[PDB]
């Protein structure tokens, strides 16, 4: 089956969408149209966030679909069939969830790593770049996979720094060293 | 001997709580900044060796 | 000072934390973290949380890997990084644990130094094959005269100590361990049984008393105490006999003999029940999980006397099963009885009537039995089995005008019953078991008044010790009773009987 | 959230790929997940309730659970024979078994396959397995003899024809 | 190359994801290459989405998800041949006799379907036996299920050993002793003992084949040992034309193993904690035990009932299959009889007048009446006194105690064990002996002239010898 297996629950829709549009080789188109409908979701916040709530009928749900495709005709065509599916399956809470899942799955198919460098402080751009350079230099990036790297500030990380990407982390923390100290100086 | 052993245990847990005071000192200081730089470059060197 | 040494040790950790696969808890409830990550993890593998919690990974499900936490949930919370240690559970094995009370991980809960033992070997490994065993023939002598004669025990075998709660079940067991000191002192390493007591669900105060008693009797130096106390978590309890078995394997593999006393598998069962239910696997018969048979069986066939090509060694075992109402009909007892090769069933009434040992002679059997019995003791206690059989029938004849034969049996039998009393926490030497039973067999003791049996016993032993410790040592060392020795013994008994 | 049979990724993929599978799901089905001697089939929308279906494994089944989007057939047959995504064709008839006169001196199995193998069964018709009991009005009192040759069961138990009488 | 990647390892229930349209069928055997050699998983469901649910035979401890699996394509094929007699074989058809790779001809699937109605036995047949107690009061029957009761050791195993010897004389048959939930230590002794008594001689000929299925082996492998064993037997029966006698051990452990696998599969275990598919599991196994046109299997099974409850559904299901029950008594062993068989609690349903022959039946009925009366008479006769016997009653007592001694008949395997060479007694000649004893031809001949002897001919010799 098409690259990158996602075991998403209601993400099975995204997986399906991916393989279906991969086999029709209209995945870039899909991604772009998905961005556009996702944008029109964000740009429809009243009753497009506040009526993603399940209270819609079949008939009323269908008419929400019809209003959305009146707003734009930039649709994959397979995602118009997917829109039909989501209306019929009354999948609406995991609607942006499916969008996110297809986006991740798609841009994984395209290749693009994600990453974050959670820290106790917002690091320099020089730091971002130096670390990004370092990460690309390290055999972790083997090419065919790009990178996103967001340093985030989290008070929770006490001590060190933590680099995260590719399910590979280096987690420097004070806490572990404190732990060893505490245990042995109480025993 | 019993009070001696007890006193040794007591001294280490007292001095442990004094370490907690030093922990609070380290995480306040901009040694927190300068050692973050050390840790950052160390991870750069280490992870590049991977 | 000591603090400086610890700080130096902390300076000595700085290792690159490039965790190839990390996890993040998705949700943690009930000590069943469901982790996102851990792609290449091995099943049952040890995982280390941010909380530092240790776990095993019973469920490898496609979307989530369901860690079972060994640790407490107290610090655990959602999102916690889950480093993949990448090593399935292993515990130090080797002679390093002699006189060391350790938890399952291997931490010395007595704190008798960090355990330095030969290797750390994994907790679960499959039981020895058909051809990797040779039949039992080597006795083991528990000092408990009744055990040694009525149900003689050998090496690398299983045989229950199934009995009612808090009848000092542990006391009966502990007596065996104490007698192993005598043999332990002895050079031959088959005679050196390096005992392992597995204290399961037993409160730390109780085990502290156990430890203290063991220390009083200087037994901590062949003894090993694997401890999963009442507080100790159900994963630890679950893996505790398996972990213990591995320790035994080093000895067994080294060809030595050793005795592992799993006390009590009934509390092991409860821990598995807790685990199964928490993983929502259906609970088997009597709400005790369905694979409890499988669990116990996996453990219990590791107790085995290996072949002589596998360097004639063993891991003797004596599981302890707690019978809630005395019901051997209870699902866990019935299963275990089927699995094992012998049972000893202590009788509560006898215990209450102060007969300690409280053994129910009928409901005690050993299948290996007399194959693993000292020849001397076999000779002078074949008779004892038959006499006791009659005594059981003539028990009800205690309700009187009785046949002279019956009345004689009743007298002989009562004196015997008292003879097989052995005050708790005082083992006896085999070279002193055999003369006394011979006397009873020859009916010498029948004449001696019941109250004076006790006085007779200790006195007789000293009388024998004075008169002929040449005989006693000869009997001990030959291990057989020759017609000349039995002749001399009948005479000696007559002489003692006169006084 | 919820699990629906259409969420099965191959089914889901057809819906995304345009829609459906060209009305083949009204009278033939294709098997989904299977095991436990019951199969969940996709299609067969014209299935009569308690129809006999023939799977291409040769196994025939009686539709038991008619559910929205799926039917849960019960396999009159062994599991190994049946395999997923197999094409199930409607027999088109409620479960019937051949009935007639020429079953006197015949051993058949439950499908009416002569397991005495004394050729094909001479059966006038086939008749639906379940048929309603005759009511009060088509009933009539018994009076015919059935003699068992066992005196007790023929003098303490009187038996006549058309009755319902337990032997326990 | 049909392959799939492991997508779960919850217990020994391993779900494998196969690429589309490259799906195994149910009951296929999958082999996962491992440093454990292989792990054999048997496909027990299709979960759809091109994934299956399988069970494991070999333990899954330390299994890594996503590992490629290779599909054998069908239920495990285990080696068969005359060569394979005298091999201790594990479930996966590999030597555990440790005398190296099994010398094999053909290999065959472990699951097999019961022969047709036509190829089932159309009329009963009485398998020959050599134990007189057996040959009168519960004569063996070809395709029969004979359920042992009473302790092992000097009990069941020695009895089983005797049967192998007898079978070798009787037909020249073979056996496969399959031991389920077998204490490996005890099994070693049995193997070594079987070697010693030469029913296995690998320096000679080994009639019995051993399949030992230890309790430590996973429940799935416990379930599958039986099906494997039956296949071996069937190679002899169908494809070497043989008549064989196949021992099975405890069916409690058969049930126990199956019950777990059901529960693991998520199927609601029926009452008394026994699988919903309980009936079918016995049904398939014990309808492969039959007399075919080619040969006949006959199976001696050991029926260990838990808690002495015959009311339990699994024992009841067993009794439905059982044609005979052999109920060894320890009281009988204590009466100095080896046979240890309890004659009054040993019963077969094939014992009917025509079935065993009218003469045999009439003799049997008389022997039953004699024994039944002897026991009952002895109850109050012992209390009242032996001189309170009537002339008729003490004639019966005289005859009966002579019959009691006549039961003693050493076993060929137990030539060493009793110390007396076994006395093999053919079924016709057993009847002859009892006709004469009933007619009191040997009621003028001493009691211990019948002690430890065989048939009519044997007790002519002993009658003379006891006196002379």
Swiss-Prot record, chain A:
Swiss-Prot/TrEMBL keywords: ATP synthesis, Hydrogen ion transport, Ion transport, Membrane, Mitochondrion, Mitochondrion inner membrane, Transit peptide, Transport
GO biological process: proton motive force-driven ATP synthesis; proton motive force-driven mitochondrial ATP synthesis
Keyword Secreted: no
Pfam families: OSCP (PF00213)
Subcellular location: Mitochondrion; Mitochondrion inner membrane
Keyword Membrane tagged: yes
GO MF annotations, alphabetized: proton-transporting ATP synthase activity, rotational mechanism
PROSITE patterns: ATPASE_DELTA (PS00389)
GO cellular component, one term: mitochondrion
InterPro entries tied to this protein: ATP_synth_OSCP/delta_N_sf, ATPase_OSCP/d_CS, ATPase_OSCP/dsu
Family: Belongs to the ATPase delta chain family.
Function: Mitochondrial membrane ATP synthase (F(1)F(0) ATP synthase or Complex V) produces ATP from ADP in the presence of a proton gradient across the membrane which is generated by electron transport complexes of the respiratory chain. F-type ATPases consist of two structural domains, F(1) - containing the extramembraneous catalytic core and F(0) - containing the membrane proton channel, linked together by a central stalk and a peripheral stalk. During catalysis, ATP synthesis in the catalytic domain of F(1) is coupled via a rotary mechanism of the central stalk subunits to proton translocation.
Other facts: Present with 32400 molecules/cell in log phase SD medium.
Name the UniProt record assigns to this protein: ATP synthase subunit 5, mitochondrial
Organism of origin: Saccharomyces cerevisiae (strain ATCC 204508 / S288c) (Baker's yeast)
Swiss-Prot record, chain B:
Compartments (UniProt record): Mitochondrion; Mitochondrion inner membrane
Note: Present with 12900 molecules/cell in log phase SD medium.
Annotated function: Mitochondrial membrane ATP synthase (F(1)F(0) ATP synthase or Complex V) produces ATP from ADP in the presence of a proton gradient across the membrane which is generated by electron transport complexes of the respiratory chain. F-type ATPases consist of two structural domains, F(1) - containing the extramembraneous catalytic core, and F(0) - containing the membrane proton channel, linked together by a central stalk and a peripheral stalk. During catalysis, ATP synthesis in the catalytic domain of F(1) is coupled via a rotary mechanism of the central stalk subunits to proton translocation.
Subunit structure: F-type ATPases have 2 components, CF(1) - the catalytic core - and CF(0) - the membrane proton channel. In yeast, the dimeric form of ATP synthase consists of 17 polypeptides: alpha, beta, gamma, delta, epsilon, 4 (B), 5 (OSCP), 6 (A), 8, 9 (C), d, E (Tim11), f, g, h, i/j and k.
Family label: Belongs to the eukaryotic ATPase B chain family.
Name of this protein: ATP synthase subunit 4, mitochondrial
Residues shown, of full length: 193 to 242 of 244
Curated annotation (Swiss-Prot), chain C:
Site, Required for activity: residue positions: 364
UniProt keyword list: ATP synthesis, ATP-binding, CF(1), Hydrogen ion transport, Ion transport, Membrane, Mitochondrion, Mitochondrion inner membrane, Nucleotide-binding, Phosphoprotein, Transit peptide, Transport
GO CC annotations, alphabetized: cytosol; mitochondrial inner membrane; mitochondrial intermembrane space; mitochondrial nucleoid; mitochondrion; proton-transporting ATP synthase complex
Domain of life the protein comes from: Eukaryota
PROSITE patterns with a match to the protein in the record: ATPASE_ALPHA_BETA
Subunit text: F-type ATPases have 2 components, CF(1) - the catalytic core - and CF(0) - the membrane proton channel. CF(1) has five subunits: alpha(3), beta(3), gamma(1), delta(1), epsilon(1). CF(0) has three main subunits: a, b and c.
Residues annotated as binding ATP: 163-170
Lineage of producing organism: Eukaryota, Fungi, Dikarya, Ascomycota, Saccharomycotina
Outcome following mutation: residue 248 to D: In ATP1-2; growth-defect
Species the sequence originates in: Saccharomyces cerevisiae (strain ATCC 204508 / S288c)
Main subcellular location of this protein, as a coarse class: mitochondrion
InterPro entries listed in its UniProt record: ATP_synth_asu-like_sf (IPR023366), ATP_synth_asu_C (IPR000793), ATP_synth_asu_C_sf (IPR038376), ATP_synth_F1_a_nt-bd_dom (IPR033732), ATP_synth_F1_asu (IPR005294), ATPase_a/bsu_AS (IPR020003), ATPase_F1/V1/A1_a/bsu_N (IPR004100), ATPase_F1/V1/A1_a/bsu_N_sf (IPR036121)
PANTHER family for this protein: ATP SYNTHASE SUBUNIT ALPHA, MITOCHONDRIAL (PTHR48082:SF2)
Protein name: ATP synthase subunit alpha, mitochondrial
NCBIfam families documented for this protein: atpA, PRK13343.1
Curated annotation (Swiss-Prot), chain E:
Residues the record lists as Phosphothreonine modifications: 72, 197
The protein's enzyme class: translocase
Modified residues (Phosphoserine): 333
Gene Ontology BP, a term: proton motive force-driven ATP synthesis
Subcellular location field: Mitochondrion; Mitochondrion inner membrane
Gene Ontology MF, one: proton-transporting ATPase activity, rotational mechanism
InterPro entries to which the protein is assigned, alphabetical: AAA+_ATPase, ATP-synt_VA_C, ATP_synth_F1_bsu, ATPase_a/bsu_AS, ATPase_alpha/beta_chains, ATPase_F1/V1/A1_a/bsu_N, ATPase_F1/V1/A1_a/bsu_N_sf, ATPase_F1/V1/A1_a/bsu_nucl-bd
PROSITE patterns: ATPASE_ALPHA_BETA
Gene3D superfamilies found in the cross-reference section: 2.40.10.170, Bovine Mitochondrial F1-atpase, Atp Synthase Beta Chain, Chain D, domain 3, P-loop containing nucleotide triphosphate hydrolases
Family annotation (SMART domains): AAA (SM00382)
EC number, UniProt record: 7.1.2.2
Record key words, sorted: ATP synthesis, ATP-binding, CF(1), Hydrogen ion transport, Ion transport, Membrane, Mitochondrion, Mitochondrion inner membrane, Nucleotide-binding, Phosphoprotein, Transit peptide, Translocase, Transport
Binding of ATP, residues: 150-157
Annotated Gene Ontology cellular component terms: cytosol; mitochondrial inner membrane; mitochondrial intermembrane space; mitochondrion; proton-transporting ATP synthase complex
Catalytic activity as recorded in UniProt: ATP + H2O + 4 H(+)(in) = ADP + phosphate + 5 H(+)(out)
CDD domains xrefs: ATP-synt_F1_beta_C, ATP-synt_F1_beta_N, F1-ATPase_beta_CD
NCBIfam families named among the record's database cross-references: atpD
Other facts: Present with 164000 molecules/cell in log phase SD medium.
Similarity comment: Belongs to the ATPase alpha/beta chains family.
Protein name: ATP synthase subunit beta, mitochondrial
Lineage, opening ranks: Eukaryota, Fungi, Dikarya, Ascomycota, Saccharomycotina
């Amino acid at each position: 089956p098409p690259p990158v297996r996602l075991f998403g629950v209601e993400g099975t829709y995204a997986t399906a969408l991916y393989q279906a549009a991969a086999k029709n080789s209209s995945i870039d188109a899909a991604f772009q149209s998905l961005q556009k409908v996702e944008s029109t979701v964000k740009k429809n916040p009243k009753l497009g966030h506040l009526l993603l709530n399940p209270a819609l009928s079949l008939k009323d749900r269908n008419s929400v679909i019809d209003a959305i495709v009146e707003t734009h005709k930039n649709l994959d065509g397979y995602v118009v069939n997917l829109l039909k599916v989501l209306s019929e399956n009354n999948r609406l809470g995991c609607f942006e969830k499916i969008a996110s899942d297809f986006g991740v799955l798609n841009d994984a198919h395209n290749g693009l790593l994600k990453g974050t460098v959670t820290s106790a402080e917002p690091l320099d751009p020089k730091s971002f770049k130096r670390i990004e350079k370092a990460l690309s230099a390290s055999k972790l990036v083997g090419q065919g996979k790009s990178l996103k790297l967001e340093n985030v500030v989290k008070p929770e990380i006490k001590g060190g720094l933590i680099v995260e990407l590719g399910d590979k982390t280096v987690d420097l923390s004070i806490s572990t060293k404190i732990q060893k100290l505490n245990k042995v100086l109480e025993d | 001997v019993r009070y001696e052993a007890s006193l040794r245990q007591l001294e280490q847990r007292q001095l442990a709580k004094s370490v907690i005071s030093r922990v609070q000192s380290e995480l306040g200081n901009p040694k927190f900044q300068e050692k973050v730089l050390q840790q950052s470059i160390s991870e750069i060197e280490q992870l590049l060796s991977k | 000072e000591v603090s400086s040494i610890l700080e130096e040790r902390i300076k000595g950790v700085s290792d690159e934390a490039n965790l190839n696969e990390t996890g993040r808890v998705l949700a943690v409830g009930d000590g069943i973290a469901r982790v996102f990550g851990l792609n290449n993890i091995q099943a049952e593998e040890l995982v280390e949380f941010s909380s530092g919690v240790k776990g095993m990974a019973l469920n490898l499900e496609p979307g989530q890997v369901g860690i079972v936490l060994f640790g407490s949930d107290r610090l655990v919370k959602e999102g916690e990084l889950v480093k993949r240690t990448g090593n399935i559970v292993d515990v130090p094995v080797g002679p390093g644990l002699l006189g060391r009370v350790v938890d399952a991980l291997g931490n010395p809960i007595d704190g008798k130094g960090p355990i330095d033992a030969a290797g750390r070997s994994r907790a679960q490994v499959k039981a020895p094959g058909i051809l990797p065993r040779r039949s039992v023939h080597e006795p083991v002598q528990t000092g408990l005269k009744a055990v040694d004669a009525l149900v003689p025990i050998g090496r690398g075998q299983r045989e229950l100590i199934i009995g009612d709660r808090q009848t000092g079940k542990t006391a009966v067991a502990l007596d065996t361990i104490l007698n192993q000191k005598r043999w332990n002192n002895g050079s031959d390493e088959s005679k050196k049984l390096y005992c392992v007591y597995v204290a399961v669900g037993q409160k730390r105060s109780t085990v502290a008393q156990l430890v203290q008693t063991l220390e009083q009797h200087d037994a901590m130096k062949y003894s090993i105490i694997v401890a999963a106390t009442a507080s100790e978590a159900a994963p630890l309890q679950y893996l505790a006999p398996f972990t213990a078995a591995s320790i035994g394997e080093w000895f067994r593999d080294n060809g030595k003999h050793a005795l592992i006393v799993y006390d009590d598998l009934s509390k092991q069962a409860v821990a598995y029940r807790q685990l199964s239910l928490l993983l929502r696997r259906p609970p088997g018969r009597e709400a005790y999980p369905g694979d409890v048979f499988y669990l116990h069986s996996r453990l219990l066939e590791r107790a085995a006397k290996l072949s002589e090509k596998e360097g004639s060694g063993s891991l003797t075992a004596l599981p302890v099963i707690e019978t809630q109402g005395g019901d051997v009909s209870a699902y866990i007892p019935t299963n275990v009885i089927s699995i094992t090769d012998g049972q000893i069933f202590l009788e509560a009434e006898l215990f209450y009537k102060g007969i300690r040992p409280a053994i129910n002679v009928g409901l005690s059997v050993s299948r290996v039995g007399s194959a693993a019995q000292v020849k001397a003791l076999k000779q002078v206690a074949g008779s004892l089995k038959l006499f006791l059989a009659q005594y059981r029938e003539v028990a009800a004849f205690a309700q009187s005008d009785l046949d002279a034969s019956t009345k004689q049996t009743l007298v002989r039998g009562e004196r015997l019953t008292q003879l097989l009393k052995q005050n708790q926490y005082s083992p006896l030497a085999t070279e002193e078991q055999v003369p006394l039973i011979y006397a009873g067999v020859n009916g010498h003791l029948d004449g001696i008044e019941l109250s004076r049996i006790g006085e007779f016993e200790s006195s007789f032993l000293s009388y024998l010790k004075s008169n002929h410790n040449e005989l006693l040592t000869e009997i001990r060392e030959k291990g057989e009773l020759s017609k000349e020795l039995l002749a001399s013994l009948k005479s000696a008994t007559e002489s003692f009987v006169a006084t | 959230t919820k699990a629906q049979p259409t969420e099965v990724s191959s089914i889901l993929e057809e819906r995304i790929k345009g829609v459906s599978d060209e009305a083949n799901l009204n009278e033939t089905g294709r098997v989904l997940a299977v095991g436990d001697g019951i199969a969940r089939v996709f299609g067969l929308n014209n299935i009569q309730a308690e129809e006999l279906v023939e799977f291409s494994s040769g196994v025939k089944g009686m539709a038991l659970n008619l559910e929205p989007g799926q039917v849960g057939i019960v396999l009159f047959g062994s599991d190994r024979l049946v395999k997923e995504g197999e094409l199930v064709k409607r027999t088109g008839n409620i479960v019937d078994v051949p009935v007639g006169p020429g079953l006197l001196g015949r051993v058949v199995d439950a499908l009416g396959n002569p397991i005495d193998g004394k050729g094909p069964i001479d059966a006038a018709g086939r008749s639906r397995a379940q048929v309603k009991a005759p009511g009060i009005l088509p009933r009539r009192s018994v009076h015919e003899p059935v003699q068992t040759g066992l005196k007790a069961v023929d003098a303490l138990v009187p038996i006549g024809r058309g009755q319902r009488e337990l032997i326990i | 190359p049909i392959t799939g990647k492991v997508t779960a390892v919850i217990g020994a229930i391993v779900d494998v994801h196969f690429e589309q349209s490259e799906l195994p069928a149910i009951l296929n055997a999958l082999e996962i290459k491992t440093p454990q050699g292989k792990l054999v998983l048997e496909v027990a469901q299709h979960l759809g989405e091109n994934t299956v649910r399988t069970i494991a035979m070999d333990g899954t401890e330390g299994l890594v998800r996503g590992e490629k699996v290779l599909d054998t394509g069908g239920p495990i094929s285990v080696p068969v041949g005359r060569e394979t007699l005298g091999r201790i074989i594990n479930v996966i058809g590999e030597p555990i006799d440790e005398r190296g790779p099994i010398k094999s001809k053909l290999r065959k699937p472990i699951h097999a379907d019961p022969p047709s109605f036509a190829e089932q036995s159309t009329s009963a047949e009485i398998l020959e036996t050599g134990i007189k107690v057996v040959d009168l009061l519960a004569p063996y029957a070809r395709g029969g299920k004979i359920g042992l009761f009473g302790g092992a050791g000097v009990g069941k195993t020695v009895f089983i050993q005797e049967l192998i010897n007898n079978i070798a004389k009787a037909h020249g048959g073979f056996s496969v002793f399959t031991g389920v939930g077998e204490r490996t230590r005890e099994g070693n002794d049995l193997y070594r003992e079987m070697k010693e008594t030469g029913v296995i001689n690998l320096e000679g000929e080994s009639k019995v084949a051993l399949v030992f299925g230890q309790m430590n082996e996973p429940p799935g492998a416990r379930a599958r040992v039986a099906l494997t064993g039956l296949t071996i037997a069937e190679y002899f029966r169908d494809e070497e034309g043989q008549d064989v006698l196949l021992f099975i051990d405890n069916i409690f452990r058969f049930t126990q193993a199956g019950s777990e696998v059901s529960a693991l599969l998520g199927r609601i275990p029926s009452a008394v904690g026994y699988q919903p598919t309980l009936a079918t599991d016995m049904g398939l196994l014990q309808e492969r035990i039959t007399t075919t046109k080619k040969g006949s299997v006959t199976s001696v099974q050991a029926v260990y009932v838990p808690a002495d409850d015959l009311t339990d559904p699994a024992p009841a299901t067993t009794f439905a299959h059982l044609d005979a029950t052999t109920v060894l008594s320890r009281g009988i062993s204590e009466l100095g009889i080896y046979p240890a068989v309890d004659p009054l609690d040993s019963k077969s349903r094939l014992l009917d007048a025509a079935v065993v022959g009218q003469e045999h039946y009439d003799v049997a009925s008389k022997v039953q009446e004699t024994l039944q009366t002897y026991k009952s008479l002895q109850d109050i006769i012992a209390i009242l006194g032996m001189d309170e016997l009537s002339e008729q009653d003490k004639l019966t007592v005289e005859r009966a105690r002579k019959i009691q001694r006549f039961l003693s008949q050493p076993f060929a395997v137990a030539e060493v064990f009793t110390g007396i060479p076994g006395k093999l007694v053919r079924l016709k000649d057993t009847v002859a002996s009892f006709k004469a004893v009933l007619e009191g031809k040997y009621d003028n001949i001493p009691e211990h002239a019948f002690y430890m002897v065989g048939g009519i001919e044997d007790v002519v010799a002993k009658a003379e010898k006891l006196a002379a």
